[PDB]
């Protein structure tokens, strides 16, 4: 003889998708649409609650991809746009006075750049990285981009580096947050807390290694969405970081020429002192260190007696064969063959980088940007958090695949899930209305 | 096993008054209604007085609406009776008992579950 | 706290009714998602009031449990379940529930009506 | 089924009202009609709990009918008149039944509140 | 009119809260002026509706006057000041009062449950 | 046959018919299609 | 026929160089100056 009773504000949610609301405490990140983040924010510990989270099916991820590209994008719209730069250039190689191993890398290229006036053309010479620009057959050459997309040129004002951004729930909606220590990416989680925001994700851009990310509480922890599956990758969270010292050592020299109403078109000018080559630092002893915990954890999945080789990616564009980073203004592609070149069965390392200005990001096409040069010598001291692995018998290979930005994003968004609260539910009390 | 053990007064003169302290352990106080109930010496039980499990609530028979108020404190597990106007037909043995009331989420009692031993009011 | 309550059993959670319903309400893409919480909101409202419960958190009803629905004991669903084991259990009956609801209700205003209408 | 009692007399058509209140609520451009439609749903709601019928669909009031805004009787309202048609015949007297409404609903709070003042 | 009993006494403007009532709800940027104000209009009858106030203007509750809040006299508070002064007064005591009134209308729901559950 | 005002002459007539008429049109020259780039990222499609 | 409404024996203190409508004003004079400039031509081949 029980009755249905109507409750409103029940602790009843579901899984959804919906808009998060972006929070920060000139800079390409910052966005004056972002609300005031809370200076004390309060986080909820749920206790008895188990909840199954999965890291690849997490909407948040392609929210923050979506707006990361857009900001992006809305910060490179209101800055010069090269389009008079696609013109031919006659480039012979920069050829400094002391012999370097690095003839070719830099070419100085003449070329007819318009200005203010419609009815003249400036003669410039420029400097451009080998990688800018591509020979048509001094020598001609065009920008490796003018056969595929117009050059935006990035505000020389705009800083590039990392801010963190908090996603917070919208009213109705609620972020859980994990907390299960050495949580896999999937499963039943046992620890969860909601939050009304999540911490503070630096949106980093970068290929292979992961940078300037969050570290597994206890032990490396590797994720993947089927890892039996070569097609998908495999993101490691390291519990200690890797510091690698990241350099462009030479001291460059920018020269900036008006090319119209309002526009200036900053260029690469010289090279004072000698030409030395970018590059990065990573201790020996430390990588040693962190390849031999990953193969432990590797061998914990395909077999305590098989061998876990590591190699160099197989080929394809730059972005993905390199470990590509933006650092100090400048945008960094470093070999990273001498990291993994190793077979594991049963003092410091210097990787060279080459530096590009014209980058396609987001794996678009037809959509280049312009990094202006950086004056002087820049230097980066970074921490890699994490590895994005690939896979390809008694042996296994596994290379740094890459690329996807959405990884990376994963792997600090693999603790959070956004669920709609159901307030009303029934329940058969006795209790009868008048 | 639940145990009540009431504690209160004697011999109080006509019109004056009394109040009755009952101690209860055994079981948690909180999740049960709490009701006193009258026995004269010369006559059966009669159902004097009724409060819930939180003491939000009580009910008493119509003729002491006026005399007798219930209460009951959750956190020192004690359920205590003050009667005022003390009137010749009241005297008689007052008993604790666990029951007769559930909070609607509960099933239903309507009964008592425990009896303590029982205080003797006189006049 | 908001959800502290998750994981406590169906007792112990309908005490804290009010954190969670202030939480429910406390460029494109955002204005969407604001109009879009505030028409579930108003949907829960008006389904409450339609039930005759729009200005209560418990509300009291004369639909009776019919126990197909469920034929557990009142100390095995206040007591031992959480509201997140409830709502998977009678998922598939929530509708045939708001219907009886709403025609009790829609009875009960007649038989109001007609009971103001007596002399 | 929604609207479906629109060609009905007042009365049939006074058992559906759950129907159509179910169903009122149920970029730029799309943005400021949903927003609008949530604003005079409100203004509706609002409306009503001004005249102390916030939770009801039938509310019954002190406000006595003037004869002079339809002088019909009920037989002829409730069995043989539709609601468009009475709508469009006391379209010109809604604003004086609302405002009675409105001045009687203050003047029950005002009464209900020194009933509630006597010790 | 509008905001007319403004500098008026609390006891005489306490009779045209209907006009201020009806008057509360009367591109990007203008979107979400109005978004932002259905929220706040929302939060209001919200947080009423938690103190069981859902329907009314003027709503007794159960909290009692802690007289540290104010000491006044009520003839100091209704005939001899203004709501801004009032306002202005209790502005460091209104998350106390209103803490008190959703306690007890927990309470009261509480309570109100567990005396239809006698049969 | 729908018209605003039928005796009008300013208002055209809207002619429903409760059978349809087949009508089968055809561009019976094989055009060939060339494309040239223009610009960056930008091509000219015209008939060859 | 815009209504006033008089209010009696209120005092309010105003400040006028502290008024968020002279910012709103000028965002909105800004805003339809440009929206009338871009439907414009844009006269670039004078810069000669
Ligand atoms: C990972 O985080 C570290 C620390 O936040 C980043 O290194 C930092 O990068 C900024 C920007 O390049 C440096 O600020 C610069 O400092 C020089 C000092 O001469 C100044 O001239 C510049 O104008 C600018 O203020 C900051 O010092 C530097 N911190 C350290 C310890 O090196 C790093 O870049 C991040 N990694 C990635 C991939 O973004
Ligand atoms: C790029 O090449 C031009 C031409 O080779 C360089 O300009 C010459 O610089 C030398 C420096 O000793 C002068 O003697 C010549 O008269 C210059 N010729 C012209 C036409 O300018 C220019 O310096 C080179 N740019 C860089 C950065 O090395
Ligand atoms: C610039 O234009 C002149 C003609 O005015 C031409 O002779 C010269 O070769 C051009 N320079 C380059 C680098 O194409
Ligand atoms: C020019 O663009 C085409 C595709 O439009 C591409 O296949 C080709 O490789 C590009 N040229 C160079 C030198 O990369
Ligand atoms: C959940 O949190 C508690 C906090 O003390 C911890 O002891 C427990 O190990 C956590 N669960 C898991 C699966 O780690
Ligand atoms: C790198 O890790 C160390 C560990 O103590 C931390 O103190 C430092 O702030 C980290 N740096 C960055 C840039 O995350
Ligand atoms: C990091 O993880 C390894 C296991 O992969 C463990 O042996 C090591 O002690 C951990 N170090 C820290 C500082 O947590
Ligand atoms: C992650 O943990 C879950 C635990 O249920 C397991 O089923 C899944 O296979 C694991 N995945 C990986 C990549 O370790
Ligand atoms: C995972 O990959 C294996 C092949 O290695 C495949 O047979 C299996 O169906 C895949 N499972 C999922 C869930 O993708
Ligand atoms: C780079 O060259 C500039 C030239 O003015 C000089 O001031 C600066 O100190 C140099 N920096 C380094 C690191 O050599
Ligand atoms: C990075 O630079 C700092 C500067 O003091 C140095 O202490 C640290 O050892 C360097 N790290 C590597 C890996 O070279
Ligand atoms: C370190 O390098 C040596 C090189 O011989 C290798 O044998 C060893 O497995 C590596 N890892 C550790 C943890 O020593
Ligand atoms: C691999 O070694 C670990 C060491 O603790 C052991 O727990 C695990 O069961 C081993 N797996 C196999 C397949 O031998
Ligand atoms: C990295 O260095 C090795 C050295 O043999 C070279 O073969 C490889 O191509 C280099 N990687 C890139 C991306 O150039
Ligand atoms: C979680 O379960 C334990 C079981 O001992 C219980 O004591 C505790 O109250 C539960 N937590 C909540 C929030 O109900
Ligand atoms: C209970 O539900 C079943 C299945 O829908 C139905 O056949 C039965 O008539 C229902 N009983 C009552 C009393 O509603
Ligand atoms: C329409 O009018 C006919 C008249 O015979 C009546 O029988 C029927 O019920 C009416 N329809 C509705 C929906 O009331
Ligand atoms: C009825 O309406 C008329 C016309 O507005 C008015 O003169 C009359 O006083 C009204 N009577 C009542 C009782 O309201
Ligand atoms: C303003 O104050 C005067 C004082 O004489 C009073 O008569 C009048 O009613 C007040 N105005 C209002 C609107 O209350
Ligand atoms: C009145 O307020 C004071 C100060 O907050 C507090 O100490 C006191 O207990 C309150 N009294 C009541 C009856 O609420
Ligand atoms: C359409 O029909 C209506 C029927 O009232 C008639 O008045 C009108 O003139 C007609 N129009 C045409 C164009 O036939
Ligand atoms: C229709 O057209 C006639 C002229 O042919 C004109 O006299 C008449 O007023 C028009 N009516 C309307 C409604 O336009
Ligand atoms: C049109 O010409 C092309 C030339 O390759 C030929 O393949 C195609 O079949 C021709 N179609 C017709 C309809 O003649």
Same mark, same amino acid.
């Given at each position: 003889?029980?009755?249905?009773?109507?409750?409103?504000?029940?602790?009843?949610?579901?899984?959804?998708?919906?808009?998060?609301?972006?929070?920060?405490?000139?800079?390409?990140?910052?966005?004056?649409?972002?609300?005031?983040?809370?200076?004390?924010?309060?986080?909820?510990?749920?206790?008895?609650?188990?909840?199954?989270?999965?890291?690849?099916?997490?909407?948040? =991820?392609?929210?923050?991809?979506? %707006?990361?590209?857009?900001?992006?994008?809305?910060?490179?719209?209101?800055?010069?746009?090269?389009?008079?730069?696609?013109?031919?250039?006659?480039?012979?190689?920069?050829?400094?006075?002391?012999?370097?191993?690095? @003839?070719?890398?830099?070419?100085?290229?003449?070329? &007819?750049?318009?200005?203010?006036?419609? %009815?003249?053309?400036?003669?410039?010479?420029?400097?451009?990285?080998?990688? %800018?620009?591509?020979?048509?057959?001094?020598?001609?050459?065009?920008?490796?981009?003018?056969?595929?997309?117009?050059?935006?040129?990035?505000?020389?004002?705009?800083?590039?580096?990392?801010?963190?951004?908090?996603?917070?729930?919208?009213?109705?909606?609620?972020?859980?947050?994990?907390?299960?220590?050495?949580? &896999?990416?999937?499963?039943?989680?046992?620890? =969860?807390?909601?939050?009304?925001?999540?911490?503070?994700?630096?949106?980093?851009?970068?290929?292979?290694?992961?940078? &300037?990310?969050?570290?597994?509480?206890?032990?490396?922890?590797?994720?993947?969405?089927?890892?039996?599956?070569?097609?998908?990758?495999?993101? =490691?969270?390291? &519990?200690?970081?890797?510091?690698?010292?990241?350099?462009?050592?030479?001291?460059?020299? =920018?020269?900036?020429? @008006?090319?119209?109403?309002?526009?200036?078109?900053?260029?690469?000018?010289?090279? #004072?002192?000698?030409?030395?080559?970018?590059?990065?630092?990573?201790?020996?002893?430390?990588?040693?260190?962190?390849?031999?915990?990953?193969?432990?954890?590797?061998?914990?999945?395909?077999?305590?007696?098989?061998?876990?080789?590591?190699?160099?990616?197989?080929?394809?564009?730059?972005?993905?064969?390199?470990?590509?980073?933006?650092?100090?203004?400048?945008?960094?592609?470093?070999?990273?063959?001498?990291?993994?070149?190793?077979?594991?069965?049963?003092?410091? #390392?210097?990787?060279?980088?080459?530096?590009?200005?014209?980058?396609?990001?987001?794996?678009?096409?037809?959509?280049?940007?312009?990094?202006?040069?950086?004056?002087?010598?820049?230097?980066?001291?970074?921490?890699?958090?994490?590895?994005? #692995?690939?896979?390809?018998?008694?042996?296994?290979?596994?290379?740094?695949?890459?690329?996807?930005?959405?990884?990376?994003?994963?792997?600090?968004?693999?603790?959070?899930?956004?669920?709609?609260?159901?307030?009303?539910?029934?329940?058969?009390? @006795?209790?009868?209305?008048? | 096993?639940?145990? !009540?053990?009431?504690?209160?007064?004697?011999?109080?003169?006509?019109?004056?008054?009394?109040?009755?302290?009952?101690?209860?352990?055994?079981?948690?106080?909180?999740?049960? +209604? *709490?009701?006193?109930?009258?026995?004269?010496?010369?006559?059966?039980?009669?159902?004097?007085?009724?409060?819930?499990? /939180?003491?939000?609530?009580?009910?008493?028979?119509?003729?002491?609406?006026? /005399?007798?108020?219930?209460?009951?404190?959750?956190?020192?597990?004690?359920?205590? !009776?003050? *009667?005022?106007? !003390?009137?010749?037909?009241?005297?008689?043995?007052?008993?604790? +008992?666990?029951?007769? *009331?559930?909070?609607? !989420?509960?099933?239903?009692?309507?009964?008592?579950?425990?009896?303590?031993?029982?205080?003797?009011?006189?006049? | 706290?908001?959800?502290?309550?998750?994981?406590?059993?169906?007792?112990?959670?309908?005490?804290?009714?009010? $954190?969670?319903?202030?939480?429910?309400?406390?460029?494109?893409?955002?204005?969407?998602?604001?109009?879009?919480? $505030?028409?579930?909101?108003?949907?829960?409202?008006?389904?409450?009031?339609?039930?005759?419960?729009?200005?209560?958190?418990?509300?009291?009803?004369? $639909?009776?449990?019919?126990?197909?629905?469920?034929?557990?004991?009142?100390?095995?669903?206040?007591?031992?379940?959480?509201?997140?084991?409830?709502?998977?259990?009678?998922?598939?009956?929530?509708?045939?529930?708001?219907?009886?609801?709403?025609?009790?209700?829609?009875?009960?205003?007649?038989?109001?009506?007609?009971?103001?209408?007596?002399?």
């Amino acid at each position: 003889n029980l009755w249905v009773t109507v409750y409103y504000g029940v602790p009843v949610w579901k899984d959804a998708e919906t808009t998060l609301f972006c929070a920060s405490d000139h800079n390409v990140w910052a966005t004056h649409a972002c609300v005031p983040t809370d200076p004390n924010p309060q986080e909820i510990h749920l206790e008895n609650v188990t909840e199954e989270f999965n890291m690849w099916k997490n909407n948040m =991820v392609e929210q923050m991809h979506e %707006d990361i590209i857009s900001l992006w994008d809305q910060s490179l719209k209101p800055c010069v746009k090269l389009t008079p730069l696609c013109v031919t250039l006659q480039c012979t190689n920069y050829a400094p006075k002391l012999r370097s191993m690095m @003839r070719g890398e830099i070419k100085n290229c003449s070329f &007819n750049m318009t200005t203010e006036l419609r %009815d003249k053309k400036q003669k410039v010479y420029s400097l451009f990285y080998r990688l %800018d620009v591509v020979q048509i057959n001094n020598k001609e050459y065009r920008l490796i981009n003018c056969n595929t997309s117009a050059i935006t040129q990035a505000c020389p004002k705009v800083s590039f580096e990392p801010i963190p951004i908090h996603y917070c729930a919208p009213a109705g909606f609620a972020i859980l947050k994990c907390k299960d220590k050495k949580f &896999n990416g999937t499963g039943p989680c046992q620890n =969860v807390s909601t939050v009304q925001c999540t911490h503070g994700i630096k949106p980093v851009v970068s290929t292979q290694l992961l940078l &300037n990310g969050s570290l597994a509480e206890e032990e490396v922890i590797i994720r993947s969405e089927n890892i039996t599956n070569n097609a998908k990758n495999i993101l =490691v969270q390291l &519990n200690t970081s890797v510091q690698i010292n990241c350099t462009r050592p030479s001291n460059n020299t =920018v020269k900036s020429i @008006r090319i119209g109403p309002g526009q200036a078109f900053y260029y690469f000018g010289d090279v #004072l002192g000698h030409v030395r080559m970018a590059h990065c630092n990573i201790s020996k002893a430390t990588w040693n260190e962190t390849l031999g915990k990953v193969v432990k954890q590797l061998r914990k999945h395909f077999g305590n007696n098989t061998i876990i080789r590591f190699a160099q990616s197989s080929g394809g564009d730059l972005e993905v064969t390199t470990h590509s980073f933006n650092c100090g203004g400048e945008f960094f592609y470093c070999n990273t063959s001498g990291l993994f070149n190793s077979t594991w069965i049963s003092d410091s #390392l210097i990787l060279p980088c080459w530096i590009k200005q014209i980058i396609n990001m987001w794996q678009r096409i037809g959509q280049a940007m312009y990094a202006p040069p950086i004056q002087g010598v820049i230097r980066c001291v970074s921490n890699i958090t994490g590895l994005i #692995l690939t896979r390809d018998s008694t042996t296994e290979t596994f290379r740094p695949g890459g690329g996807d930005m959405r990884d990376n994003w994963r792997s600090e968004l693999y603790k959070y899930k956004v669920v709609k609260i159901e307030p009303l539910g029934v329940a058969p009390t @006795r209790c009868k209305r008048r | 096993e639940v145990q !009540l053990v009431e504690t209160g007064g004697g011999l109080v003169q006509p019109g004056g008054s009394l109040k009755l302290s009952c101690r209860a352990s055994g079981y948690t106080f909180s999740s049960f +209604a *709490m009701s006193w109930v009258r026995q004269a010496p010369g006559k059966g039980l009669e159902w004097v007085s009724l409060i819930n499990d /939180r003491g939000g609530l009580t009910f008493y028979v119509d003729s002491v609406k006026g /005399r007798f108020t219930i209460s009951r404190d959750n956190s020192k597990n004690t359920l205590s !009776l003050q *009667m005022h106007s !003390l009137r010749d037909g009241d005297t008689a043995v007052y008993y604790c +008992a666990t029951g007769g *009331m559930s909070s609607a !989420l509960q099933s239903s009692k309507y009964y008592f579950d425990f009896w303590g031993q029982g205080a003797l009011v006189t006049v | 706290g908001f959800l502290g309550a998750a994981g406590s059993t169906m007792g112990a959670a309908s005490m804290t009714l009010t $954190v969670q319903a202030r939480n429910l309400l406390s460029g494109i893409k955002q204005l969407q998602a604001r109009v879009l919480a $505030v028409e579930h909101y108003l949907r829960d409202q008006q389904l409450l009031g339609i039930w005759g419960c729009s200005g209560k958190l418990i509300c009291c009803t004369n $639909v009776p449990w019919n126990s197909s629905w469920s034929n557990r004991n009142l100390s095995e669903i206040w007591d031992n379940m959480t509201w997140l084991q409830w709502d998977k259990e009678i998922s598939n009956y929530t509708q045939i529930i708001y219907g009886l609801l709403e025609e009790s209700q829609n009875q009960q205003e007649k038989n109001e009506q007609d009971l103001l209408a007596l002399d």
